[PDB]
Design a protein around this ligand. Structure first.
Ligand SMILES: *C[C@@H](O)CCO[C@H]1O[C@H](CO)[C@@H](O)[C@H](O)[C@H]1O
Length: 487
């Protein structure tokens, strides 16, 4: 008997303003006290946003790493490991949000003469949270493309943070690939047009993406094809529309072509930025990760409408996550997913929501492509039931008494640290959760060592990636309930 291979690492997200909106580290004593509570609980490490708008706020290449180095030193002196998000997106910006950190002002200034640097919807609304993938390779930003800006930021990060890498503090780099750091389109802009559980919209109207579609359609002898015009609006349900209804036009030749184009572009965006990230971090003992959004609403209906508009071309007979996983394979990149805490019974009926099945699909897809898969909780939860649902997803086949289980999450990251988490009953529940994630073992500072990051393998075409889409395979079997509950 040796249950060590069952241990699942637990990380905790730091507050969104771990570094102030002014790019100053001003809550060090408070954070130190909170981290003492995480260490008392056996936590493996923390995760933090490394905000582009804070570090490169002055001007091109004017990186100010002062505050982040102070934070990382504090985390190192607490004996915790660190997952760093390359946060190329706006923090907050929605109604009610306390912490609001835009992308750099000088980047947004380019948008005054070129508003098409932003994802744009069918009514022309610009989303200012992230740069459209359509400008990934367009040299619009004082001579640099968006991908060059991302690569240069990561290079400066590596140079400045080399001692934390070499000391084994920084162990994961999560590459932000869209809104909220997630590889998606901003199809559900809460407080800017959408309310849950609207189907969302296709956000492909910027001129760069329109030109790209035109070129793609021309290559296949259909220059006249346009984006679908029967798709309704953000807060529709699928049967309100001809595109997304049961037996609707999403099934047609033109529908399939558009959906493939839209979702393929997201895949290509991830591939090209990961290739740069891999070049930056080559030889360091880190894992590179991407974050896939958890679009559980409308999963139960044939069109999977909200997944479609987010950019995940996922249908009963088409695995829109295994394609993403296949793209990650050459990079040895991991998937960081969400919704690990959700039960289907906790969702509203009208949302046609299946987070459990979605989680099972994404985890199975990653595992079939040989990836490490990690997860977060989608929503704040402090209760045993939530922890038990996370535990089930962390070890879907339960505990192997004598070696590693057949599948397990490589890690779990808890959203998020606050004073509320680390007092009272909330703290008691959280500590017991960490024990169970660790298979009732103490913290292992040596667990899951990373080899020096090898160079990405050969670039594969979109057609090669899409071989993963079909046939759609059933998920690996998941236990209904954890065999190691909190109690
Ligand atoms: C999609 C999932 O990570 C939702 C959480 O989003 C908030 O927290 C992350 C991590 O701290 C931030 O990158 C993001 O901007 C927040 O909105």
């Amino acid at each position: 008997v040796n249950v060590k291979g069952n241990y699942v690492q637990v990380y905790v997200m730091l507050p969104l303003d771990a570094v102030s909106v002014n790019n100053r580290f001003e809550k060090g004593d408070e954070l130190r006290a909170q981290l003492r509570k995480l260490v008392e609980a056996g936590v493996d490490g923390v995760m933090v946003d490394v905000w582009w708008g804070l570090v490169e706020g002055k001007g091109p290449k004017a990186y100010d790493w002062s505050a982040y180095k102070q934070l990382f030193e504090l985390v190192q002196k607490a004996g915790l490991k660190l997952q760093a998000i390359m946060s190329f997106h706006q923090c907050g910006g929605n109604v009610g949000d306390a912490v609001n950190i835009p992308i750099p002002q000088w980047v947004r200034d380019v948008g005054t003469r070129d508003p098409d640097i932003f994802y744009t919807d069918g009514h022309g609304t610009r989303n200012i949270e992230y740069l459209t993938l359509g400008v990934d390779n367009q040299p619009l930003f004082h001579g640099r493309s968006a991908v060059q800006m991302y690569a240069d930021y990561m290079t400066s990060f590596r140079e400045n943070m080399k001692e934390f890498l070499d000391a084994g503090v920084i162990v994961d780099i999560e590459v932000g690939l869209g809104p909220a750091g997630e590889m998606r389109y901003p199809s559900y802009p809460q407080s800017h047009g959408w309310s849950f559980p609207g189907i969302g919209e296709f956000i492909c109207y910027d001129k760069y993406l329109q030109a790209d579609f035109k070129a793609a359609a021309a290559a296949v002898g259909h220059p006249e094809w346009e984006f679908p015009n029967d798709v309704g609006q953000y807060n529709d349900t699928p049967e309100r529309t001809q595109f997304f209804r049961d037996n609707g036009t999403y099934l047609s030749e033109k529908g399939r072509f558009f959906l493939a184009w839209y979702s393929n572009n997201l895949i290509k965006h991830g591939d090209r930025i990961l290739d740069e990230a891999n070049k930056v971090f080559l030889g360091y003992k880190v894992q590179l990760a991407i974050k896939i959004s958890g679009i559980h609403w409308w999963y139960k209906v044939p069109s999977h409408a909200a997944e479609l508009t987010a950019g995940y071309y996922n249908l009963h007979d088409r695995d829109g996550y295994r394609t993403i996983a296949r793209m990650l394979k050459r990079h040895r990149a991991s998937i960081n997913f969400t919704c690990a805490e959700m039960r289907d019974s906790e969702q509203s009926s009208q949302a046609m929501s299946a987070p459990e099945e979605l989680v099972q699909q994404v985890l199975s897809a990653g595992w079939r492509e040989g990836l490490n898969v990690a997860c977060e909780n989608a929503l704040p939860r402090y209760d045993p039931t939530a922890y038990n649902t996370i535990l089930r997803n962390a070890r879907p086949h339960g505990i192997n008494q004598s070696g590693p289980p057949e599948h397990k999450l490589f890690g779990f990251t808890y959203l998020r640290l606050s004073n509320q988490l680390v007092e009272g009953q909330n703290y008691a529940n959280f500590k017991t959760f960490v024990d169970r994630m660790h298979a009732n073992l103490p913290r292992d500072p040596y667990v899951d060592p990373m080899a020096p990051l090898p160079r990405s393998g050969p670039e594969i075409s979109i057609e090669m990636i899409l071989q993963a889409a079909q046939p759609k395979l059933q998920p690996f079997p998941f236990q209904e309930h954890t065999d190691l509950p909190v109690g």
